[PDB]
Amino acid sequence: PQQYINSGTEIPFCDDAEFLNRLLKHIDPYPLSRMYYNAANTMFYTTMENYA
């Protein structure tokens, strides 16, 4: 193992609700359909390359 963390720890969730709202606004015009398509095909093609 190149690196590791200790047991327990804590997921660093964000807190700034205003920051979350700003991000939501910034991402609203992104079509989930297109993003899903792109991500799925990216993974599929990378898997194809690895197999080949």
Partner 1 sequence: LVPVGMAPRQMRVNRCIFASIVSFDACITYKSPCSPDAYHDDGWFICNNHLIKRFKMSKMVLPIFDNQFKMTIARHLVGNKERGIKRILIPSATNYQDVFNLNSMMQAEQLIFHLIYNNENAVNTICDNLKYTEGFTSNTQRVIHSVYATTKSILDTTNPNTFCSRVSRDELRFFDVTNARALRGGAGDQLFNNYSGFLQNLIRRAVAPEYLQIDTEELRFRNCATCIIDETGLVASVPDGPELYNPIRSSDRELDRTLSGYEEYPTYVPLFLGYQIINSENN
Partner 2 sequence: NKVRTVTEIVNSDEKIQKTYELAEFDLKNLSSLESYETLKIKLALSKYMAMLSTLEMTQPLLEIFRNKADTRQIAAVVFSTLAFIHNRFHPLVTNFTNKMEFVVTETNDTSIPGEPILFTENEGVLLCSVDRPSIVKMLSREFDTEALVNNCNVRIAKTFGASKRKDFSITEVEATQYLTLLLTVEHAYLHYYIFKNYGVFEYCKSLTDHSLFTNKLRSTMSTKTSNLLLSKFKFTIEDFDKINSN
- Contact residues for partner 1, defined by CB under 8 A: 1-6, 8-12, 18-19, 22-23
CA distance 21 to 27: 10
Supply the minimum distance, in Å, between the C-beta of residue 36 and partner 2: 6
Question: Whose structure tokens read 């606004």?
Answer: 25
DSSP secondary-structure letter at 28?
T
Which residues from 17-46 bind partner 2, rule CB under 8 A?
19-20, 22-24, 26-28, 30-40, 42-46
Q: What are phi and psi of 7, to 5 degrees?
A: -70, 160
Interface contacts to partner 2, rule CB under 8 A: 1-16, 19-20, 22-24, 26-28, 30-40, 42-47, 49-51
